[PDB]
Write an enzyme that holds these catalytic residues in place. Sequence first.
Site, PDB file in Angstrom:
ATOM      1  N   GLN A   1       0.821  -1.221   0.000  1.00  0.00           N
ATOM      2  CA  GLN A   1       0.000   0.000   0.000  1.00  0.00           C
ATOM      3  C   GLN A   1       0.849   1.263   0.000  1.00  0.00           C
ATOM      4  O   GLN A   1       1.085   1.853   1.048  1.00  0.00           O
ATOM      5  CB  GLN A   1      -0.923  -0.012   1.224  1.00  0.00           C
ATOM      6  CG  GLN A   1      -1.987   1.061   1.271  1.00  0.00           C
ATOM      7  CD  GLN A   1      -3.152   0.758   0.378  1.00  0.00           C
ATOM      8  OE1 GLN A   1      -3.018   0.683  -0.839  1.00  0.00           O
ATOM      9  NE2 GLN A   1      -4.318   0.595   0.977  1.00  0.00           N
ATOM     10  N   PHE A   2       1.296   1.675  -1.186  1.00  0.00           N
ATOM     11  CA  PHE A   2       2.241   2.798  -1.305  1.00  0.00           C
ATOM     12  C   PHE A   2       1.616   4.116  -0.846  1.00  0.00           C
ATOM     13  O   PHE A   2       2.307   4.981  -0.327  1.00  0.00           O
ATOM     14  CB  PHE A   2       2.872   2.916  -2.722  1.00  0.00           C
ATOM     15  CG  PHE A   2       1.975   3.565  -3.756  1.00  0.00           C
ATOM     16  CD1 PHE A   2       1.738   4.952  -3.739  1.00  0.00           C
ATOM     17  CD2 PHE A   2       1.375   2.797  -4.754  1.00  0.00           C
ATOM     18  CE1 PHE A   2       0.899   5.555  -4.689  1.00  0.00           C
ATOM     19  CE2 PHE A   2       0.542   3.382  -5.709  1.00  0.00           C
ATOM     20  CZ  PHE A   2       0.299   4.762  -5.679  1.00  0.00           C
ATOM     21  N   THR A   3       0.308   4.247  -1.010  1.00  0.00           N
ATOM     22  CA  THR A   3      -0.385   5.475  -0.679  1.00  0.00           C
ATOM     23  C   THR A   3      -0.187   5.891   0.784  1.00  0.00           C
ATOM     24  O   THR A   3      -0.618   6.968   1.201  1.00  0.00           O
ATOM     25  CB  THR A   3      -1.863   5.354  -1.046  1.00  0.00           C
ATOM     26  OG1 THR A   3      -2.543   4.555  -0.067  1.00  0.00           O
ATOM     27  CG2 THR A   3      -1.978   4.688  -2.401  1.00  0.00           C
TER      28      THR A   3
END
Lengths: 149, 153
Positions: A78-80
Amino acid sequence: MRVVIQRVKGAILSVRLEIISEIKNGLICFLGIHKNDTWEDALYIIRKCLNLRLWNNDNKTWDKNVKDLNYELLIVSQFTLFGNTKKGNKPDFHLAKEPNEALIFYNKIIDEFKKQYNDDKIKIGKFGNYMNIDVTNDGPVTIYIDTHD
Amino acid sequence: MRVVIQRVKGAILSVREKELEIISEIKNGLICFLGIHKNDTWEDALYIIRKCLNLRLWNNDNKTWDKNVKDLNYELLIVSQFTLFGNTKKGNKPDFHLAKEPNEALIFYNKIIDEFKKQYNDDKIKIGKFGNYMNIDVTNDGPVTIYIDTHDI
């Protein structure tokens, strides 16, 4: 790495919608990988997801971990989470490790989750693809860790 | 003040003699797990409400990270989560000592839920039972997770 951990009675993970992953009780983990993460950062997160006592046991609270209860883990990249939103309303993902080096690192994180807990207890998604995840939040219990502390 | 914001297609909240009842429901929108620090000033709450209400976490036909909650006419489900100040530095058992004492935490949380309604549409904000044990089914849309700690800012 950053991680968001939620306790769940189950989670179903679908793609474009084709189901591709399920867990009963356990933990969904949204794992962000930072641009300068060392295999050490990985370790701390794995070791915390697996050993954290997040279930009650008879009349105790915060007693049992995900291994203790033979539960499962769904790990989603989950890069966000490195979405800096401090300046303006458009999240800025500059701190976030690049998708390619990310995938390889994330993979090593899964190997290790398996080595430490169990091959059949680690479920994943399809990295870098739109995913639909139904999550039965139990509690709910959300745990945040930034491993730069 | 800390918030986890996960973008969603919908979310259904339920409370508990025996088994569950749906008291809250949203469709397309955000779920916001909101933890309140012991030394949180109203300005910490304002930043949280603002960003929840203003962050552009939705793609818009050809353009990414472009539309916010209100533009798309969407909803929010605001769930208090003290566990966010779970301190996992110490050991394997988390201590939440840094969270706000639940009686004043509850006072603060409602002030916040008002401000939420005020700063958007008042009929577009749903919540959960502050004290209580809850079950939340969440269709995560991406997924898209966003973290904010006001004490950084």
